[PDB]
Amino acid sequence: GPIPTAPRENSLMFLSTLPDDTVPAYGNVRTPPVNYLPGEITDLLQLARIPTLMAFERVPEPVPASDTYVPYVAVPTQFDDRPLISFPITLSDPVYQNTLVGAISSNFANYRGCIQITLTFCGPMMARGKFLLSYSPPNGTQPQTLSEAMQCTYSIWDIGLNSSWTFVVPYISPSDYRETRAITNSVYSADGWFSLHKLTKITLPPDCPQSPCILFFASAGEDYTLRLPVDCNPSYVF
Amino acid sequence: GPIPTAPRENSLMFLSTLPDDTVPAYGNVRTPPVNYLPGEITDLLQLARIPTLMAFERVPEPVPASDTYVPYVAVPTQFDDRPLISFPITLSDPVYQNTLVGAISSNFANYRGCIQITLTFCGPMMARGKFLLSYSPPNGTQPQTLSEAMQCTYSIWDIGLNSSWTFVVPYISPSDYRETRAITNSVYSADGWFSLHKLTKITLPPDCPQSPCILFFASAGEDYTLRLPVDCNPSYVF
Amino acid sequence: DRVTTQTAGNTAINTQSSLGVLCAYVEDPTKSDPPSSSTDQPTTTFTAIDRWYTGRLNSWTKAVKTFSFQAVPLPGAFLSRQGGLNGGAFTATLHRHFLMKCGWQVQVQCNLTQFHQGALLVAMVPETTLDVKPDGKAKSLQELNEEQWVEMSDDYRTGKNMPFQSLGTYYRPPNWTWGPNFINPYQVTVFPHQILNARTSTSVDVNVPYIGETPTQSSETQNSWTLLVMVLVPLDYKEGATTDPEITFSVRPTSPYFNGLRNRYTAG
Amino acid sequence: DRVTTQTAGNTAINTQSSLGVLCAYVEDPTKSDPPSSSTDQPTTTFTAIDRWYTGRLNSWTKAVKTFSFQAVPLPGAFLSRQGGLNGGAFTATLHRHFLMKCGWQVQVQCNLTQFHQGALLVAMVPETTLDVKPDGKAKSLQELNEEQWVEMSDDYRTGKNMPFQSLGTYYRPPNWTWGPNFINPYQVTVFPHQILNARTSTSVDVNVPYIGETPTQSSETQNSWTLLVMVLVPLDYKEGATTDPEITFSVRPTSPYFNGLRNRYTAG
Amino acid sequence: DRVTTQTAGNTAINTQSSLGVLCAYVEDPTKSDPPSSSTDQPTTTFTAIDRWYTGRLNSWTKAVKTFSFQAVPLPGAFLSRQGGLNGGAFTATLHRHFLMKCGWQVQVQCNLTQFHQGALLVAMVPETTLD
Amino acid sequence: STDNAETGVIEAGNTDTDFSGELAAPGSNHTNVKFLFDRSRLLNVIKVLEKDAVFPRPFPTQEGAQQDDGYFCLLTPRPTVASRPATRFGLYANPSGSGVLANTSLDFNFYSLACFTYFRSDLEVTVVSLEPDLEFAVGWFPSGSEYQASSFVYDQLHVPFHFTGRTPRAFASKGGKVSFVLPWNSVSSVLPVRWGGASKLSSATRGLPAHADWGTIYAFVPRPNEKKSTAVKHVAVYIRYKNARAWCPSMLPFRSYK
Amino acid sequence: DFNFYSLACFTYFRSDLEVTVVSLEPDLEFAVGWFPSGSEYQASSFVYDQLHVPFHFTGRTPRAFASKGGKVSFVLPWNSVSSVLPVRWGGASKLSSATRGLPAHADWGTIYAFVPRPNEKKSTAVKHVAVYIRYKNARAWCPSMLPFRSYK
Amino acid sequence: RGNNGNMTFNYYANTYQNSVDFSTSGILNPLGYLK
Amino acid sequence: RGNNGNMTFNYYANTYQNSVDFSTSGILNPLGYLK
């Protein structure tokens, strides 16, 4: 006998994100297997953990063309009590725009966990110096003073045999998740600032080249997590 | 009670290749059984393995009519360092067009496995000679020289008591499957060339007839396989 | 083992160039049941129809083109006495029974030797109307003698010339283009066959069972098996060799069942 | 453990600043099966192709801008003899086989010392058409000598200049904007790579297996791995230091399988 | 047992008048050691050089006198491409190695039949400067 | 390897027979007869009945015959003409002339892979309207049966007898489709793809089988004869072979080289 | 597929493909024809009752008839001769005159939309159909780059 | 099997979904043999 | 698992609902190693 059925009001609706299969039209097809091919990607956070280059403007004020964005910050000999480079911890900011962490995360609504900033000193081996790397919680005014950076979460990095320092930005958030994109620039989307201060000047023996450069990488920590995939930005194709 | 149901968006769609049964209208019908009738065909590759005649043009240059296509290649006494017959290993080529391998395979999109070419010497028993049968991988220029055929996959066939030679064309492909029809004439559809060279001249005692003929068969190997049935060519009915 | 003398009843045929017996499509086309669709007692085999019958085909020549062929319908050659194939008691039993079921053993002989080249395809081909003219009437022996070989052309490749019902003056006469009783001449080696090559043998053996759309068929009209002798390579020889070699054939029925015993057939 | 001398066949290459060997994306890119898609016996490795091959790149200078790069296609550099990379028996085997499957061991040397600053990104990048001009033809050695370095600009960031089929006069010519063979220059560190920093080392090691869209690929056309040497930090030094340091590279194939043995390749 | 089809690699050569294979001067000329006088690793065999190579000699005629001969040096015919004997990967390996050690399998075909008389001596002769 | 093709048997060889290699692994089974023919394809296009039909006369049909051509569809892979079984397929190359254009049909997909002599299967029939939002119904009668060609009167409306009967009638909804599967109903054991016999002892045509069919279908509007307009409506026929079995290996059609 | 390249981020891809076909015109009766990778369109018509019926109404490849205002949805297997789809490619398909970086069979086939009516029934008003795709059992290999984002 | 995937459950009996023949009282076979 | 929730019952067989590859004869892996 015919089974009595009550079709719901949402019948014949196509739903793009429906978690169910549809009818097969061309079954009994065996594809070539894939034993030989290595490098299988189970999860996109495996590529988020890979460090990639950030971007900054090269030098103020005159530049031949504004497109001259550069993956390093040059260290001048001149001393003034302001950071050499600073950027907000906000994953929609241009400093993350061409990193894998920013590009992957920008297609997700929320993130959780730590961002890992990696620095690389590309100057000569004879160079000696010290840098203070400081992460500031959100505040009414961004800190600029080295004394103000010293009051925040900070680590001192020494130039020596090992050329690199991995700075893990701590996850300090009022909510369990944070917004990837700062629409209203609220506390849930902008998590303060990271800043670089020189502690001592870089010292050089004579005939060394002046102004060495620190190469910047951005990467996801091992606790980093992404949630709620959203529509992409198609701006890259135009 | 009525069972709650959610009909999908593809409801009432007729799909010609749907792997499911429909409602019976005229059941409880018993047909006459089929115990007596032999020759049951389980699989079309059983007929693909059966050798059938290829086709070539008889003689250059003048022919009474261009429809005079012939299942053999005549062997002239004249010597020149070019093959007597050659054809591409491409299952849409006219040399396979009226073979069972070509006709069955042309209704499928892909093939895998070896093609088996069978030769038959139909000349007199007193004739003696030797032939070199060579299969060439794809190349920028088709080989014509006997020295070039010797560098490829080749077998020497001797005329004697046994009249036939089965040449298995090896399956050498970059992909696991190959295209039946050469649309763009890519490496995935055209698998090089088979060629026939005379090694020595055919020797005859006097009053033998001149120019004996080699009869050609095409057949599927035991590893031959076909996949993805496609629409037929209805050109034969017009 | 090329010398084989095969015995059936009072007739024994011999060859010294035997290629073996092609057993298709069962391991023995003599292994077979009483036909389940008739309930009268069948007339089964006996030793005067358990024998071979021999007939003559037309001579093979230099002028015979590629894929030219001769068609021998079975049991129609017995009914028509094609090539002198008198069937005796077997034909006398055929004309007195409504149904007939049997397989066939066939051997075709052609007297080649050395200094000759050419090849003959000898196949049992189901199912043909090749013995019938395009007007729908069967070929007479005079017409079979006048051919002397059926030429392959556009008709018989596409099935365009197969027998048909005319539509009449009510309809437009259609352009007849295709039919399922075509011969694809390159594909005739799918059938149970052997090749009578001049190089290797003078005789060929094919052994076939009964097949049909029904478990038995009418004695007068069935053409479920046809002995097809087709040229693959034309005859060539130098002058002084034997001109015009002859083609003979030997036919034996296997496990005959006869049903519907009645008087001798008289046409309407 | 910075002193490592790696031995392969009759060739041994040495470094005293070894950072280790980058093994991606398996624990050993030499562990590998006969390619399942060809049934002929493969031509496997032997001790005269189990060796290293060394070539020269163009000199690195102060004037070389950030993200300027050199592209070394593999096995295309052997086919083109790019940078003097004669491959001997390996190239002789390449030209005589239709299919080729192998991984690669690469080491790039650049002779830095103290009083110099700069960094070179050395990556094996799948898959590139960076050796090909935008008109669709491959770069000649004269053109590779004239560059002397490929400048990063709007093209090669968006893929706008990748080789293409022209539509013809029938269609409107479209505004070409984007292509999937882009270089995102900030993201090249996703690939198997090491950084040739002037501070810490003079040589880098990357070890890669075979990859492809098929379990084997054509010997003449494949570009499944490309040695990319890209500037991250430009060269700077005071006058009196060594001008124009040279860049050399050493290439070893791992577990080669050759299929489709035939004559030497001649183009159409 | 006159019908023999001998297989090597991707090449198979057939004869229907086989007299057998003359194995001299050991029971198997394939049984052999790495050459003791060189200490580098030898380049050993692989399936694209484990194959047959075919060439053409000049035609035999009535006018050819007794004991007239043709000389085919090995491996010199591969180096000179004598009679169209292109050797492919084998010749490519020959030109890139200083030393070479191998034996040889040879088969010579000539298309005689009945109504002809004559005899050809086919020998592997060490060692000649006849080329 | 050496063989004799005159044997009629040739062993299916491999790469390892003469050369060095191995078998290519199997990876598909789509050449299976039960799998291949089990897909739907266009059989024929028939006109829709709006009145009680007069079934087409047997051949040769003469002048002045009052009959309804083009409404009945034989369920045959074999060629047909004027809803009756045919031997030769026929077509019309030119419009000009005078006389009735007879309907002809083929399953081109079947004969492209038959390749055999005998065939038997059950038959899924699917009926699709070529006119939008058509309300229509399908009438079927088996092999050996015939069309009931008359009408009965209800409330002065002529109601044809083909609205009823013991054989299946399937009413489609407005813009709906009809689908059902039919058994092998013939007196014969199997369908002959090619045939050499004769159906009668006198005046029969050689090669024309009488009952190589799964019956005949027709399309009709479920409205009485008084409701009619001049606009002719059309219906397409789809067939699918269920549990297909084949016997007696044979040829594939000739492919012209022009 | 802008959404795909926004997160590929890899070199090789393989999946089954759910195809969903939605009419942009209201209450359209339409049907979907598909033919696999390596196949081709059958470009001719046959005559039934002096109405030209095109051959793409039939064939061995899937045909799906939508209802009036209905939708078509079905999933397709990986049908290529190739093992996987290359997201980016450096090779060449032919030995002569090919284009570098253009793969020949990196596809799940081709689809087309057609009205289930013969050629005589036609009006001038062109009608449009949108194509939706969904990747089933997606697998990825060989980590790679994401597209450049302009700073202007 | 045939072109059938919905193997889990059949609503109609076999003698209604298909025909069956009445009682009277892979690895491939070769279509030909040699004696 | 994938974006699938209706886990209780599958109507079509696996080789009809999906492809399968033919036979020839969380915690995250690092994409690179150092020797």
Whether the CB of I25 is below 8 Å from some CB of chain F: the reply is: yes
> Amino acid identity, residue A237?
V
CB neighbours of F241 closer than 8 A, spacing ≥ 6? F37, F38, F121, F122, F123, F124
The candidate with the shortest Cα–Cα distance to F169, out of F233, F219, F132, F123, is F219
CB neighbours of C3 closer than 8 A, spacing ≥ 6? C14, C15, C16, C18
Which helix (DSSP H) or strand (DSSP E) does residue B155 occupy? strand B153-158
* Breaks in chain F (C–N > 2.5 Å) following residue: none
Is F61:C168 a contact under the CB 8 Å cutoff? Answer: yes
- Reduce the DSSP state of residue G2 to 3 states and report it: helix
Is B218:B52 a contact under the CB 8 Å cutoff? Answer: yes
> Checking DSSP bridges between strand A69-70 and strand A56-57, what pairing results, if any?
antiparallel
Alpha-carbon distance of C50 to C46, in angstroms, equals 6
Placement of tokens 């060339």 in the chain: B193
In chain F, residues with a C-beta closer than 8 Å to the C-beta of C99 are none
Alpha-carbon distance of C173 to H34, in angstroms, equals 50
CA distance D38 to chain G (A): 14
Nearest chain I Cα to H4, which residue? I16
Q: Do F92 and C175 touch (CB under 8 A)?
A: yes
Q: Is the dihedral of CA F8, F14, F17, F23 positive or negative?
A: negative
Whether the CB of B174 is below 8 Å from some CB of chain D: the reply is: yes
Alpha-carbon distance of C81 to E63, in angstroms, equals 61
Placement of tokens 């027979």 in the chain: F17
Question: Would you give the distance in Å from CA D215 to the centre of its chain?
Answer: 20
**Three-class SS string for chain D?**
CCCEEEEECCEEEEECCCCCEEECCCCCCCCCCCCCCCCECCECCCCCCCCCEEEECCCCCCCCCCCCEEEEEECHHHHHCHHHCCCCHHHHHHCCEEEEEEEEEEEEEECCCCCCEEEEEEEECCCCCCCECCCCCECCHHHHHHCCCECCCCCCCCCCCCCCCCCCCCCCCCCCCCCCCCCCHHHHHHCCEEEEECCCCCEEEEEECCCCCCCCEECCCCCCEEEEEEEEEEEECCECECCCCCEEEEEEEEEEEEEEECCCCCCC
Domain that holds residue B232: 1-238
Burial class (CB in 10 A: 0-12, 13-18, 19+), C173: middle
Pick from A35, A36, A72, A163 the residue to mutate for testing the D interface (most D CBs within 10 Å): A36
**Phi, psi of A46, deg, nearest 5:** -65, -30
Interface of C with F in 91-150 (CB under 8 A): 126-129, 132, 136, 138
In chain B, residues with a C-beta closer than 8 Å to the C-beta of E109 are 130, 156, 158, 199-200
Placement of tokens 């036939």 in the chain: B164
**Helix count and strand count (H, E) for chain A:** 3, 16
CB neighbours of C38 closer than 8 A, spacing ≥ 6? C99, C216, C259, C260
Placement of tokens 């303060």 in the chain: A192
CB neighbours of B16 closer than 8 A, spacing ≥ 6? F39, F40, F41, F238, F240, G58, G59, G61, G62, G63, G64
Cα dihedral F149, F155, F156, F161, rounded to 10, equals 0
Q: Do I26 and A33 touch (CB under 8 A)?
A: no
Q: Which two tokens stand for residue D160?
A: 């706008």
The candidate with the shortest Cα–Cα distance to H5, out of F174, A21, F11, is A21
Which helix (DSSP H) or strand (DSSP E) does residue A48 occupy? helix A45-48
What's the CATH number where F91 sits?
2.60.120.20
**Structural domains counted in chain B:** 1
Question: Would you give the distance in Å from CA E82 to the centre of its chain?
Answer: 12
The candidate with the shortest Cα–Cα distance to I12, out of G72, B15, G60, B229, is B15
Whether the CB of I19 is below 8 Å from some CB of chain G: the reply is: yes
Q: Do B114 and F13 touch (CB under 8 A)?
A: yes
Cα dihedral C87, C90, C91, C94, rounded to 10, equals -160
Maximal C-alpha separation, chain G: 64
> Checking DSSP bridges between strand A56-57 and strand A225-229, what pairing results, if any?
unpaired
Q: Do G118 and F133 touch (CB under 8 A)?
A: no
In chain H, residues with a C-beta closer than 8 Å to the C-beta of F8 are 32, 34
Alpha-carbon distance of E58 to G62, in angstroms, equals 62
Whether the CB of D30 is below 8 Å from some CB of chain A: the reply is: no
Whether the CB of A70 is below 8 Å from some CB of chain G: the reply is: no
**Phi, psi of E94, deg, nearest 5:** -60, -45
Compute and round to an integer the Cα radius of gyration of chain H: 17
Nearest chain B Cα to A6, which residue? B4
Is A212:A124 a contact under the CB 8 Å cutoff? Answer: yes
Question: Would you give the distance in Å from CA E123 to the centre of its chain?
Answer: 11
Q: Do D186 and A163 touch (CB under 8 A)?
A: no
> Checking DSSP bridges between strand D225-236 and strand D117-124, what pairing results, if any?
antiparallel
Alpha-carbon distance of F232 to F50, in angstroms, equals 9
Exposure of B199 in the CB half-sphere (CA atoms within 13 A): 28
**Phi, psi of E93, deg, nearest 5:** -75, -35
CB pairs under 8 A between F and G: 51
> Amino acid identity, residue B108?
F
In chain D, residues with a C-beta closer than 8 Å to the C-beta of I34 are 19-23
What's the CATH number where B43 sits?
2.60.120.20
Question: Would you give the distance in Å from CA C166 to the centre of its chain?
Answer: 28
- Cα angle at E6 between E1 and E8, to 5 degrees? 165
Q: Do F17 and B29 touch (CB under 8 A)?
A: no
B206-230 per-residue burial string, b: 16 or more CB within 10 A, e: under 16: eebbeebbbbbbbbbbbbbbbbbbb
Is C96:C196 a contact under the CB 8 Å cutoff? Answer: no
Is C23:C106 a contact under the CB 8 Å cutoff? Answer: no
Is F150:F164 a contact under the CB 8 Å cutoff? Answer: no
Alpha-carbon distance of A111 to A131, in angstroms, equals 29
Is D106:D57 a contact under the CB 8 Å cutoff? Answer: no
Q: Where are the extended beta strands (E) located within chain F?
A: 2-3, 41-49, 72-74, 80-81, 84-85, 89-91, 104-105, 116-129, 137-141, 151-154, 157-160, 169-171, 178-182, 191-192, 216-220, 234-249
Alpha-carbon distance of B85 to A38, in angstroms, equals 44
Alpha-carbon distance of C17 to B222, in angstroms, equals 30
Nearest chain E Cα to F1, which residue? E5
Is chain E in touch with chain A: ≥3 Cβ pairs within 8 A? no
Cα dihedral A159, A160, A164, A168, rounded to 10, equals -60
Exposure of G115 in the CB half-sphere (CA atoms within 13 A): 17
**Phi, psi of D146, deg, nearest 5:** -90, -5
- Cis link prior to F218 (omega < 30° from 0)? no
Is F50:F134 a contact under the CB 8 Å cutoff? Answer: no
CB neighbours of C119 closer than 8 A, spacing ≥ 6? B120, B122, B215, C195, C196, C197, C198, C231, C232, C233
What are the helix (H) ranges across B66-141? 100-105
Alpha-carbon distance of C161 to C175, in angstroms, equals 12
Alpha-carbon distance of A223 to A229, in angstroms, equals 19
State the resolution, in angstroms. Answer: 2.5
Compute and round to an integer the Cα radius of gyration of chain B: 24
Q: Do B209 and C236 touch (CB under 8 A)?
A: yes
The DSSP code for F5 is G
In chain B, residues with a C-beta closer than 8 Å to the C-beta of A19 are none
The DSSP code for C239 is B
Nearest chain D Cα to F16, which residue? D40
The candidate with the shortest Cα–Cα distance to C227, out of C132, C148, C134, C126, is C126
The candidate with the shortest Cα–Cα distance to A30, out of G79, C9, B182, E39, is G79
Cβ neighbour number for residue B79 with a 10 Å cutoff = 11
CB neighbours of F70 closer than 8 A, spacing ≥ 6? F46, F47, F83, F103, G49
> Amino acid identity, residue A142?
Q
Alpha-carbon distance of D68 to D57, in angstroms, equals 13
**Phi, psi of B180, deg, nearest 5:** -70, -40
DSSP for F117-134 reads EEEEEEEEEEEEESSTT-
Is B228:B107 a contact under the CB 8 Å cutoff? Answer: no
Q: Do D20 and I34 touch (CB under 8 A)?
A: yes
Q: Do A30 and F27 touch (CB under 8 A)?
A: yes
Pick from C4, C5, C21, C214 the residue to mutate for testing the H interface (most H CBs within 10 Å): C21
Exposure of A218 in the CB half-sphere (CA atoms within 13 A): 29
Alpha-carbon distance of F119 to F75, in angstroms, equals 14
Is B118:F3 a contact under the CB 8 Å cutoff? Answer: yes
**Phi, psi of D84, deg, nearest 5:** 75, 15
Q: Which two tokens stand for residue A110?
A: 């929320």
Alpha-carbon distance of D160 to D178, in angstroms, equals 5
Whether the CB of F30 is below 8 Å from some CB of chain A: the reply is: yes
Alpha-carbon distance of E83 to E53, in angstroms, equals 11
Residues paired with B198 in a beta bridge: B131
**Residue E80 to residues D181, D263, E91, Cα–Cα distance (Å):** 47, 16, 10
Burial class (CB in 10 A: 0-12, 13-18, 19+), C262: exposed
Is C82:C55 a contact under the CB 8 Å cutoff? Answer: yes
Which helix (DSSP H) or strand (DSSP E) does residue E125 occupy? none
Is chain F in touch with chain A: ≥3 Cβ pairs within 8 A? yes
Which helix (DSSP H) or strand (DSSP E) does residue A120 occupy? strand A115-121
Question: Would you give the distance in Å from CA C261 to the centre of its chain?
Answer: 26
CB neighbours of D36 closer than 8 A, spacing ≥ 6? A35, A36, B176, D215, F25, I24
**Residue I24 to residues D215, D258, F22, F28, Cα–Cα distance (Å):** 12, 19, 12, 13
F neighbours by CB contacts (3+ pairs under 8 Å): A, B, C, D, E, G, H, I
Pick from E10, E11, E47 the residue to mutate for testing the D interface (most D CBs within 10 Å): E47
Q: Do C20 and H35 touch (CB under 8 A)?
A: yes
Long-range contacts of A135-142 (CB under 8 A, 24+ apart): A135/A89, A135/A167, A135/A169, A135/A170, A135/A192, A135/A193, A135/A194, A135/A195, A136/A192, A136/A193, A136/A194, A136/A195, A137/A172, A137/A191, A137/A192, A138/A187, A138/A190, A138/A191, A138/A192, A139/A192, A142/A86, A142/A193
Alpha-carbon distance of B72 to F47, in angstroms, equals 51
Q: Is the dihedral of CA H22, H27, H28, H30 positive or negative?
A: negative
Alpha-carbon distance of D214 to D205, in angstroms, equals 27
Alpha-carbon distance of D26 to I29, in angstroms, equals 10
Q: Which two tokens stand for residue G121?
A: 């029934």
The candidate with the shortest Cα–Cα distance to E61, out of E115, E116, E104, is E116
In chain F, residues with a C-beta closer than 8 Å to the C-beta of I16 are none
**Structural domains counted in chain F:** 1
Placement of tokens 């002989």 in the chain: C109
Nearest chain F Cα to G49, which residue? F103
Is D68:D231 a contact under the CB 8 Å cutoff? Answer: yes
CB neighbours of C90 closer than 8 A, spacing ≥ 6? C49, C53, C78, C253, C256
E neighbours by CB contacts (3+ pairs under 8 Å): B, D, F
CB neighbours of C101 closer than 8 A, spacing ≥ 6? C35, C210, C212, C215, C216, C217, C255, C256, C257, C259
Which of E5, E53, E113 shows the shortest C-beta gap to B150?
Answer: E53
> Checking DSSP bridges between strand D21-23 and strand D203-208, what pairing results, if any?
parallel
Q: Which two tokens stand for residue B59?
A: 């003689």
CA distance F132 to chain A (A): 21
Burial class (CB in 10 A: 0-12, 13-18, 19+), G72: buried
Is B54:B219 a contact under the CB 8 Å cutoff? Answer: no
Which of A28, A30, A32 shows the shortest C-beta gap to F35?
Answer: A28
